[PDB]
Structure formats: C-alpha cells, structure tokens
Design an enzyme around this catalytic site. Structure first.
Site, PDB file in Angstrom:
ATOM      1  N   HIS A  69       0.799  -1.157   0.121  1.00  0.00           N
ATOM      2  CA  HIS A  69      -0.102   0.104  -0.043  1.00  0.00           C
ATOM      3  C   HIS A  69       0.976   1.105   0.152  1.00  0.00           C
ATOM      4  O   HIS A  69       1.636   1.362   1.113  1.00  0.00           O
ATOM      5  CB  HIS A  69      -0.936   0.067   1.301  1.00  0.00           C
ATOM      6  CG  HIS A  69      -1.984  -1.277   1.182  1.00  0.00           C
ATOM      7  ND1 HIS A  69      -2.433  -1.712   2.373  1.00  0.00           N
ATOM      8  CD2 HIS A  69      -2.753  -1.609   0.181  1.00  0.00           C
ATOM      9  CE1 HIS A  69      -3.393  -2.564   2.017  1.00  0.00           C
ATOM     10  NE2 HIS A  69      -3.747  -2.393   0.970  1.00  0.00           N
ATOM     11  N   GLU A  72       1.768   3.992   2.988  1.00  0.00           N
ATOM     12  CA  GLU A  72       2.264   3.575   4.281  1.00  0.00           C
ATOM     13  C   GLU A  72       3.871   3.910   4.055  1.00  0.00           C
ATOM     14  O   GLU A  72       4.456   2.636   4.464  1.00  0.00           O
ATOM     15  CB  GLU A  72       1.751   1.991   4.420  1.00  0.00           C
ATOM     16  CG  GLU A  72       0.455   2.213   4.400  1.00  0.00           C
ATOM     17  CD  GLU A  72      -0.538   0.747   4.566  1.00  0.00           C
ATOM     18  OE1 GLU A  72      -1.679   0.681   4.147  1.00  0.00           O
ATOM     19  OE2 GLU A  72       0.228  -0.242   4.636  1.00  0.00           O
ATOM     20  N   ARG A 127      -3.102   4.448  -2.243  1.00  0.00           N
ATOM     21  CA  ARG A 127      -2.864   3.141  -1.683  1.00  0.00           C
ATOM     22  C   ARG A 127      -3.056   2.315  -2.653  1.00  0.00           C
ATOM     23  O   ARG A 127      -2.215   1.136  -2.512  1.00  0.00           O
ATOM     24  CB  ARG A 127      -4.384   2.946  -0.743  1.00  0.00           C
ATOM     25  CG  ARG A 127      -4.575   1.418  -0.454  1.00  0.00           C
ATOM     26  CD  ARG A 127      -5.976   1.165   0.471  1.00  0.00           C
ATOM     27  NE  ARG A 127      -6.503  -0.088   0.787  1.00  0.00           N
ATOM     28  CZ  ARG A 127      -6.225  -0.795   1.977  1.00  0.00           C
ATOM     29  NH1 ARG A 127      -5.619   0.067   3.143  1.00  0.00           N
ATOM     30  NH2 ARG A 127      -6.746  -1.767   2.288  1.00  0.00           N
ATOM     31  N   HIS A 196       2.869  -3.472   6.968  1.00  0.00           N
ATOM     32  CA  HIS A 196       1.801  -2.445   6.555  1.00  0.00           C
ATOM     33  C   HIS A 196       1.867  -1.365   7.762  1.00  0.00           C
ATOM     34  O   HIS A 196       2.701  -1.517   8.538  1.00  0.00           O
ATOM     35  CB  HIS A 196       0.335  -2.917   6.470  1.00  0.00           C
ATOM     36  CG  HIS A 196       0.227  -3.988   5.446  1.00  0.00           C
ATOM     37  ND1 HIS A 196      -0.505  -3.353   4.197  1.00  0.00           N
ATOM     38  CD2 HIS A 196       0.731  -5.145   5.025  1.00  0.00           C
ATOM     39  CE1 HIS A 196      -0.606  -4.448   3.337  1.00  0.00           C
ATOM     40  NE2 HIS A 196       0.146  -5.376   3.579  1.00  0.00           N
ATOM     41  N   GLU A 270       1.228  -4.325  11.403  1.00  0.00           N
ATOM     42  CA  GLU A 270       0.814  -3.029  11.038  1.00  0.00           C
ATOM     43  C   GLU A 270       1.461  -2.105  12.150  1.00  0.00           C
ATOM     44  O   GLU A 270       1.271  -2.140  13.212  1.00  0.00           O
ATOM     45  CB  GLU A 270      -0.707  -2.964  11.282  1.00  0.00           C
ATOM     46  CG  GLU A 270      -1.464  -3.856  10.451  1.00  0.00           C
ATOM     47  CD  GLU A 270      -3.162  -3.723  10.283  1.00  0.00           C
ATOM     48  OE1 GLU A 270      -3.553  -4.300   9.449  1.00  0.00           O
ATOM     49  OE2 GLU A 270      -3.650  -3.025  10.818  1.00  0.00           O
TER      50      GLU A 270
HETATM   51 ZN   LIG Z   1      -1.824  -1.314   4.244  1.00  0.00          ZN
END
Ligand SMILES: [Zn+2]
Length: 307
Positions: A69, A72, A127, A196, A270
């Site tokens: 993405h 990020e 994204r 992420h 994350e």
């Molecule tokens: Zn992501």
C-alpha cells in the site's frame, strides 16, 4: 553520497533514492546480497527483491514485503533500515548469524512502485496500484485484496473507485502475480511477512473466514512472543491475533494466500502509530519504529529456523 554508511536513514526517500540505495548495498556486500528483478509494475518500472544469502541453493527462505500500500511510508523506510541492518549484524549478532547461515531472506522494499511514485508527485495518500480499469474513470486495485484466498468474498469491494477494490480476478495485478510466481517457483519458503501501517498490530490468518487455522496455538504464542520483544525497547504496545477477530473480515489478503500455500509462519505487521499521525508519521519516528520492529521480526525468524 558515496556509500550506505553516509545514507540518511532518518528521513523519507523517493523511489529513485531507494533503488539507488539497493545498488550501493549490493556493490558493498556482493558476497551476501544480490538484487533480483521479479517482474515489472503496470507502468513499466522494475520490481526488485534483495536476496540475502550465505550460500547453498534453494535453502529454506523468509519472505518479507513492504509498501504494498503505497501511502504507508513508514514501511518502505523500515525496509531500507532492515537491509542495512542485515549486512551489519551478520557475523556480529550470534542469533542473526545462525539464521542467515541456514536460511535465505528475500526482502521486497517497494512492492507497489507505481503507487509509491504517485504518492510523491500527486497524491500522498494513494493506496492502490495504478492499473487502468476499462469501463471506469477510476484507477487502481487494492493489491492486498487481489490474492487468491477467499477472493471476491466480503471484506473487499467490486467497485473500481473503491480504496479496497479487489480487481477483476485474483492475481490480476502484475505486482501481485510477480510475487506469487516467484514464491511458488522457489517452493521452499518457510515464513512470509507482509508489512503495513498503521495500528500497531501483529496478525496471523485468516482474514477471509472465521475458521481457525490448524496451527493457531503455535502462531498465537509466536505473535505473543514477538510483541513482547518489540515492546521491550520503547514500550510500544501492540495487540495480536487473527485478522478476522482483530480487524474484521478482509478477503484476498496475502498471508491468507501464503498460509494456504503451506507457508506456516505467515504474519502481517501494522506498524506505528495508532491514529494520531496515521500515515503521516513524523520522520523522527523512522529509526525507533525500525529498531523495535526488528526485534519482533527477529523473534519470528528465530522460531522458523528452529522449526
Ligand atoms: Zn496496508
């Protein structure tokens, strides 16, 4: 600007700067690192993976992707730091040395290069990929909803203008198909980590179904251990658990696909923060984030070598 020792790891970089960094690293440590091109992006940019290896052939391997993405940014920055760290610690840190003496590590720092270039020149919060959709004024597919794992089920969108659009069919995105083909052809991956941001979570499968994975007890303990290691440095608090029970249904995700390919140690991180700065994490947090995340990743790698 002549070496990776003078590179500024505490700031965000452009695509070219990161690609140039990869070449410097390979030039400085030819016996440990090689740069592989596994495909091209929709718009034609090369997709590169760094392979860290001390030898052998088709040794058990660890896959780590970052930046699928594009917005990020803390993930690509962490990937650059990881690449340098691997070259510094081999032969110095006993645990990492044992891992690289037995396994190869494949690191994909910019998994979605078209989107990354787009976040620098036109839309910082982009994204998706940048593939053209016929019959639509909207562009791009959410590359983390494009994998062949519960593809098209709830937790993704069929609307081309959506931020979570899954695409026309599984692996439609060349950025995803490139990884799928490489991993399947290699056939000896033992761990698959996708990085992420944000939320401070460490998740294991599944996201597309509530069915528990057969290895739940073990993966849960590994995640618990990794979060504890990570927290020890700066006190950063992470939660862990399966995707679906922690952040709800999400279909077509990468670690659900990798786990179904028999790659047991499949986890998604994350990173920082939890929403204060969100995707616009200050550059002053790049190094602390990379350092604490390294402790969590190392913990997982230690468990795979011994398994
Ligand atoms: Zn992501």
């Amino acid at each position: 600007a002549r070496s990776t020792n003078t590179f500024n790891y505490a700031t965000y970089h452009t695509l070219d700067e990161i690609y140039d960094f990869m070449d410097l690293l390979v030039a400085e440590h030819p016996q440990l690192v090689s740069k592989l091109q596994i495909g091209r992006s929709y718009e034609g940019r090369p997709i590169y993976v760094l392979k860290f290896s001390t030898g052998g052939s088709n040794r058990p391997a660890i896959w780590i992707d970052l930046g699928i993405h594009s917005r990020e940014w803390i993930t690509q920055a962490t990937g650059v730091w990881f690449a340098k760290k691997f070259t510094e610690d081999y032969g110095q840190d006993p645990s990492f040395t044992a891992i690289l003496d037995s396994m190869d590590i494949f690191l994909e720092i910019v998994t979605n290069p078209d989107g990354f270039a787009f976040t620098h020149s036109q839309n910082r919060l982009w994204r998706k990929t940048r593939s053209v959709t016929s019959s639509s004024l909207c562009v791009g597919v959410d590359a983390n909803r494009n994998w062949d794992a519960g593809f098209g089920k709830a937790g993704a969108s069929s609307s081309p203008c959506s931020e979570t659009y899954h695409g026309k069919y599984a692996n439609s995105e060349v950025e995803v198909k490139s990884i799928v083909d490489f991993v399947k052809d290699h056939g000896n991956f033992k761990a698959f980590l996708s990085i992420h941001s944000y939320s401070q979570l460490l998740l294991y499968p599944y996201g597309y179904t509530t069915q528990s994975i057969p290895d739940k007890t073990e993966l849960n303990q590994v995640a618990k251990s990794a979060v504890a290691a990570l927290k020890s440095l700066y006190g950063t608090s992470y939660k862990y658990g399966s995707i679906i029970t922690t952040i709800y249904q999400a279909s077509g995700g990468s670690i659900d696909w990798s786990y179904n390919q028999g790659i047991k140690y499949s986890f998604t991180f994350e990173l920082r923060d939890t929403g204060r700065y969100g995707f616009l994490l200050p550059a002053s947090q790049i190094i602390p984030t990379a350092q604490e995340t390294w402790l969590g990743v190392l913990t997982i790698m230690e468990h795979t070598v011994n398994n």
